[PDB]
DNA sequence: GCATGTGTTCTAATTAGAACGCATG
DNA sequence: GCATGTGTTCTAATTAGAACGCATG
C-alpha cells in the first residue's frame, strides 16, 4: 500500500495559530501551513511559537483562486471568522452582510476553490467555527452557504470554562460524544498559579472584555489570593483555554492585548478532539 | 442550436425574454434564503443564469443579492466536460458602493463593464463570461457622473433596454423566434 | 557530622533571585525568610517558589527577638534601594535620608544575626549596591560593614553591562569570573526567534524603559522584519539570567516587569558567588 | 548590675562623640582635674581597631548638637555613627566591670528620626525635663534613667520648646548622677 | 574627557469599569 | 420567567511616553 503523507493546511483567520498547535500536539506531520491573518499581535505569536514554519499570506481577500491552486492541493481548510458583527452580545452588530460579518464569505469562497474537482476522491477536510449567540437567520444563511448544519460543542465538557460554539465541517466523528481525558483540566483550581484558591469549578465564557472574568451579574471575582479576591491572570486564562502557559507572552503585550487574542481564539482541547481522527489519514511521528 | 433554459433570480426577465428571440421553460426565484442544491438541480439543467439587484429607491443589504447569486450559480454550473456553452451575469443598478464593488468582482474573477444610456442618463455595471460584452466597447463614462446620477435618480424602474442590448449576442447559441 | 540544609535571611528580597540560584545549585534550603514590601515582588516569589519563602514584611519591623526566634541563619543577603544613592537621580537624598537609610537596617540585622563570640559556626553574608554612587556614600557603607567591596560587571557573564559593588565574606568573592558554557554572553542568544540583535551587549537596564535604547543618540537594540524594536521582557529575563516568563505573573505590564528586573541582580553573577556554598550545606 | 565597694571602683574611661563633656564631668567629679578620656567629633574615618587601641572604655556617650546651625551633618547621621562605634567598644560576654552607654537628643530628631533611634537602641527614649525650662530625650542602659519616672510632658509641649529655641545644665545633669556609685569620686 | 546611570517629574497613550442592550434557547 | 454573551463607546483614573541632571571613573 501507499504510505501516509504529511498534511497540507490552509488556515483562514489563523489568530494565534491554535490549529497548528493542535496538529503538532497530536504527532501529525505538517508539510505546509498557510495562514491568512492581519493582526500583527496574532502574527507575532504564531511566528514566535512555531519558529516561522507558518507562511503568512495577509488579508484573506488578497487570496485568489489562482493562489489556492498553486499553493495546493490542501488536505485541510480551517477558519473562524470574526463575530463582533455576528453575536448578539454586541448591540451594534452589523450583521452577516456588512462590516466584519461578510468576511465569512471569503471562507466560503476559498473553501470552494480548495475543494477537489469532481472525480478526485482524495481525502479533503474542512472546519468552520463561530459562536451560537448569533441571529437565527445568520446561522441558517451560513449553513446554507456551507450546505451543512453546525455542531455545537461547549468547551465546558473538556475545560474549566463555558464556551458554546458552532462547528461546521466534515471531520470524521465530529459529532461523536465528547469525552474527557487525563490531559483535560476540567476544574478552575487546576489552572491557577500556586497559592491561589478557585472559588468555582467553571468560569462563564471568556471574551475580549476584561470583566467577563467575574461570574454572575454581581461581579464575582473567581479567585482568592491571601486576604483579597482577584481576577484570573493572563497565564491562567491560557490554561483555561488549554494553551501552554506563556503562549501569548510575546512582544510586550499587555494583559488586555493578550485577553483580546485569547478571547477570540479556540478552546484547544475541543479542537484537539475534532482533529484527533485525522491521525489515521496522515503521517505521524 | 436547441432552445435555452435560464434561471432568473430577483428579477423576472419575462419582459424582454420573448422580445430578443427566445407552457413555459424559464424559472424565476424570489427569496432564495431557502433554496438548496437539490432545488436548483431538480429544476432541470440550464445554460445561462441571471441575477439582478433591485432598482434604486426601495429593502435588504445590497451584497445579499450578490452572495446569494454566487451560491446559486455554482449550484447551476455543469460538469467541466459538458459541451453546451454555459453563461451567466449579475447586473448592478449602481446600488453597490465602492466597498461592495470590489467584493463582487473578486467573487466573479472579472471586473465589471459600465454601459451608458446617453443620447448622461442611466448606467449599469455588469459582470459576465459572455465574450461579447467584454468584446463590445461602449462609450466611456465616469463614476463621478455615475455618483452624480444616483442622488438625483433616488429622489422621487429597471432600464432593460440596456440589458436587452447587453445579452443580445446570446442568440448564436439558441433558436430565434 | 553530616551536611545540613541552609538557613537564609534575604533582605529586600525582590523577586527571590537568591532562592533561584540556591535551588539551581542543588543546595537544600531549610528556610528562606524574606523581607519585602512590593506586592508585585512578593507575588513572583510566592508563585515561583510554591510558598517556600517566609515573608516578614517591612524590614524596619524586624526585631532582634525576631532574628533570634527565626534563626539561626547561615546566610544573610540583601541589596537595599539605591534610588537615593544612584547618581543617575538628580534628586538623590543620600545614604542618610530617603531610602538610602534603609541600608542601615541591613547593617542592623546583619549584626543581630551574627553568631556570638567563640561560636565558630560557619556564617556567610553578602551585600550588593551600585557603583555609580557617591564616593562618600561608598566610604560610609564599607565603614559600617568593616570590609571593602568587590566590583563585578555582569557583562563578563551576560549580555548586559551591570557594574555592581559586592560586600561580603563568601569564599572566592574576588576570584575572577569565567563564562560558563551555560552563560549567554551575546544579546542574540537571548532574543526570541525571528529577531536579530543590533549589539553584542547592552548597557545597564534600569527601571525606566529608555534604558534599553543604547548609545548617546538613543538607539533600539533589536531589528525584527526589517524594522527596529526594543527588547521584550522575556528577552530581558534572559539578558538577566532568569528563566523565561519568570516575571510573567499578576497581569503585570512590560514596564511593571522591567521595574522588577531593573532592580534585581544578574543571575549568573549570583550563581558564581554562591558556588562554594555547596560544600558548606546539604546538597540534593 | 551589682555594685562594688568604693575601694574597688576605679576612674571611668569615657568616649565622648559629637559633644565634649569633660567640663560636665568635673562638676560631678568623674575625673581628675590633673590630666583617661577620649573624644572624637568627626568619626567618619574612625575604624574599629582605632577604638580598641584607644583603651577599654566604660562609658561611651554621644549627643546630637543643640538647637542652632552648627548641625552640618544630617541629624540621623549622629545616631548611626554612634551605634557603629558603640559595638566597637562593647566588651566580651563575661564583662568584668560594668559597661554603660548613652545617646542624647536635644530636640533635633524628628518623629521618624526617633523611631529608628529607638529601633537601633532597642527601647523607647525617656524625656528628661527641667520643669518648662528645657528637656532632652535619652537612650541608655542606665537602670536609674528608665526607672525614675519624671514629670510628664506633651509632644505639643516639646514641639514648642524645640521651636522656641528655634525662633530665638545642672537640673538636667540628672542623667549622670547614677554613675557615681560605679566609679571613683574625686574631691 | 565625557558618556554613563538599580530615577525623578512632567507631558500624552492606554486602562478601565460601567453602561448599555435583547435575542434565544 | 430568566441570564448568558468570540462587543463598543466611554470617561475617570492610571499608566506610559520625553526632558533634566552631574558625580565620577
Ligand atoms: N481581513 C482579514 N484577513 C485575515 N484575517 C482577519 C481579517 N479580519 C479579521 N481577521 C482575523 O480573524 C480572527 C478571527 S477570531 C479567530 C481566531 C483563531 N480561530 C484562533 O484560534 O486564534 C482574528 O484574529 C482577526 O485578526
Ligand atoms: N522598607 C522596606 N522594607 C523591605 N523591603 C523594602 C523596603 N523598601 C524597599 N524595599 C525593597 O527593596 C528592594 C530593593 S531592589 C533589591 C532587589 C533584589 N536584590 C533582587 O535581586 O530582586 C525592592 O524590591 C523594594 O521593594
Author numbering:
A (entry chain D): 628 to 912
B (entry chain C): 187 to 208, 215 to 250, 253 to 313, 317 to 353, 358 to 378
C (entry chain A): 629 to 912
D (entry chain B): 179 to 213, 217 to 312, 317 to 353, 361 to 379
Text taken from the publication that reported this structure:
Mammalian DNA methylation is established by de novo DNA methyltransferases DNMT3A and DNMT3B4, and subsequently subjected to maintenance by DNA methyltransferase DNMT1 in a replication-dependent manner. Among these, mutation of DNMT3A has been identified in ~25% acute myeloid leukemia (AML) patients, which gives rise to aberrant DNA methylation patterns and increased cell proliferation, and correlates with poor clinical outcome. To gain further insights into the context-dependent DNA methylation by DNMT3A and the mutational effect of R882H, we determined the crystal structure of wild-type DNMT3A (DNMT3AWT)–DNMT3L tetramer in complex with a CGA motif-containing DNA, as well as R882H-mutated DNMT3A (DNMT3AR882H)–DNMT3L tetramer in complex with CGA- and CGT-containing DNAs.
Next, to elucidate how the R882H mutation influences the context-dependent DNA methylation by DNMT3A, we characterized the structure of the DNMT3AR882H–DNMT3L tetramer in complex with SAH and CGT-containing DNA (DNMT3AR882H–CGT), with the same sequence as that previously used for crystalizing the DNMT3AWT–CGT complex. The structure of the DNMT3AR882H–CGT complex was solved at 2.6 Å resolution, well aligned with that of the DNMT3AWT–CGT complex, with an RMSD of 0.37 Å over 849 aligned Cα atoms. Structural comparison of the DNMT3AR882H–CGT and DNMT3AWT–CGT complexes again reveals a difference in the DNA conformation: relative to the DNMT3AWT-bound DNA, the DNMT3AR882H-bound DNA moves away from the RD interface by ~3 Å, reflective of reduced protein–DNA contact. Of particular note, the side chains of residues H882 and R887 in the DNMT3AR882H–CGT complex are positioned further away from the DNA backbone than their counterparts in the DNMT3AWT–CGT complex. As a result of these structural changes, protein–DNA contact at the RD interface in the DNMT3AR882H–CGT complex accounts for a buried surface area of ~206 Å2 only, much less than that for the DNMT3AWT–CGT complex. Second, the DNA molecules in the DNMT3AR882H–CGT and DNMT3AWT–CGT complexes show differential extent of helical twist: In comparison with the DNMT3AWT–CGT complex, the DNA major groove in the DNMT3AR882H–CGT complex is positioned further away from the TRD loop.
